[PDB]
Amino acid sequence: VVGGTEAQRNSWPSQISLQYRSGSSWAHTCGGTLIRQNWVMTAAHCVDRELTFRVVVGEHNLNQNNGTEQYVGVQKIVVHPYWNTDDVAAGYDIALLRLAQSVTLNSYVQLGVLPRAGTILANNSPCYITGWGLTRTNGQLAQTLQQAYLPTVDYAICSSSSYWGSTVKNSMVCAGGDGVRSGCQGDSGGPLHCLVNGQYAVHGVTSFVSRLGCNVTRKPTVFTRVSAYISWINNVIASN
Ligand code: NA
């Protein structure tokens, strides 16, 4: 997250860190959202590589013991069947991960609430992106979980020619694009939290930014629109 602030450690208890095994260690690669005690929602592109993955819930500082973490292996990966890795602009950038164990819920570990199917945010709706991604274009990962305020940009504006044009689809949410705050590499797969009727819900799964940089004016961060995938999500969990 570029232009973020450090999150309080109990603000976003559904945020997870998706990590892969790297030699004798583990490395953060993506975010995700805990949606059941044994299921995580992330981006499909995060799990393209044939790596060994684990999820960390209750994580705040990637580089220090928080005293709150639970580490669980990924047992099954279900990518959206229409996902195509060399065409992120087509959409379907979503995957579900079944965890090897069910995690224990507490003030640091909670299920993300998802929007009702079909919900579309009005333009300029208040949302936060969260994650441990790069803090500058071509920079380095954050140590501590970051948040940035990214108001939505509706489809009509986002798909206009000076924004993303044809690359953005109605199955996506755009947010930000002010040139200061944005998602960045390592935030993919994580949540966009939007306040609706008094309650935060996870409306987006972080999908892509511009090849020109993370924080680029009129290139808002683009997210998979979770409310377009409610039936898919429920069908996968019910059949696994
Ligand atoms: Na930690």
How long, in residues, is the chain?
A: 240
Total domain count for the chain?
2
Identify whether 178 is a catalytic site residue: no
Question: Residues comprising the binding site for Ca(2+)?
Answer: 59, 61, 64, 69
- Do residue 69 and residue 176 come from a single domain? no
Please check whether residues 101 and 158 belong to one and the same domain.
no
* Distance from Cα 59 to the centre of ligand 1, integer Å: 5
Ligand 1: distance of its center to the CA of 57 in Å? 10
Nearest to 163 by CA among 174, 172, 171: 174
Q: Are 179 and 212 in contact (CB under 8 A)?
A: no
CA distance 25 to 38: 23
- Whether 214 and 120 map to the same domain: the answer is yes
Task: Return the structure tokens found at 9.
Answer: 């450690």
For residues 129 and 219, membership in a common domain is answered with: yes
- Specify whether 125 is located in the same domain as 8: yes
- Which structural technique was applied? X-ray
Pick from 206, 216, 64: which is nearest to 136 by CA?
A: 216
Query: Which residue is catalytic, options 28, 45, 80, 203?
Result: 45
Is residue 28 part of the annotated active site? The answer reads no
Beta bridge partners, 130, equal 147
Residue 44, domain extent: 13-111+228-240
7 and 117 belong to one structural domain? yes
- Residue whose structure tokens are 């892969």: 20
Which residues of the chain come before a gap where C and the next N are over 2.5 Å apart?
none
- With a CB cutoff of 8 Å and minimum separation 6, the contacts of 41 are 32, 33, 35, 94, 95, 96, 97, 112, 202, 205, 226, 233
Q: How far is the CA of 16 from the centre of ligand 1 (A)?
A: 11
Closest CA to 217 of 169, 190, 182: 182
Measured between alpha carbons, how far apart are the two ends of the chain, in Å?
33
Among the listed residues 5, 14, 9, the one whose alpha carbon sits nearest the alpha carbon of residue 199: 14
Q: What is the DSSP letter of 8?
A: P
- Distances 124 to 148, 157, 197 between C-alpha atoms, Å: 14, 11, 15
Under a CB-based contact definition with an 8 Å cutoff, are residues 207 and 229 in contact? no
CA distances from 94 to 91, 141, 184, 220, 233 (A): 8, 22, 17, 19, 9
Assess whether 123 and 76 both reside in one domain: no
Contact 62, 55 (CB under 8 A): no
Q: Which amino acid would we find at residue 230?
A: I
42: tokens are 């992330």
Catalytic residue among 14, 188, 207, 210: 188
At residue 89, the 3 state secondary structure works out as: helix
Distance CA 183, CA 192 (A): 10
CB 28 within 8 A of CB 39: no
Looking at the structure, tell me whether residues 116 and 183 fall in a common domain.
yes
Which value in Å is the resolution of this experimental model?
1.4
Inter-residue contact 36 to 165 (CB < 8 Å):
no
Q: What DSSP string describes 101-167?
A: SPPPPBTTB-PPP-PPTT--PPTT--EEEEES-BSSTT--B-SB-EEEE--EE-HHHHTSTTTTGGG
- How far away, in angstroms, is 70 Cα from ligand 1 center? 10
Alpha helices in the chain (DSSP H): 155-158, 230-238
Same domain, 102 and 147: no
45 is catalytic: yes
- Find where tokens 């755009």 sit: 174
CATH number of the domain to which 96 belongs: 2.40.10.10
Domain identity same for 44 and 59: yes
**Whether residue 94 is found in the same domain as residue 201:** no
Residues 6+ apart with CB under 8 A from 121: 127, 152, 154, 173, 194, 196, 203
Cα–Cα distance measured from residue 71 to residue 80, given in angstroms and rounded to the nearest whole number: 25
For 87, the token pair is 């065409």
Q: What angle do CA 6, 12, 16 make, to 5 degrees?
A: 95
List residues bridging with 98 in a β-sheet.
39, 76
Both 215 and 116 in one domain: the answer is: yes
CB 203 within 8 A of CB 33: no
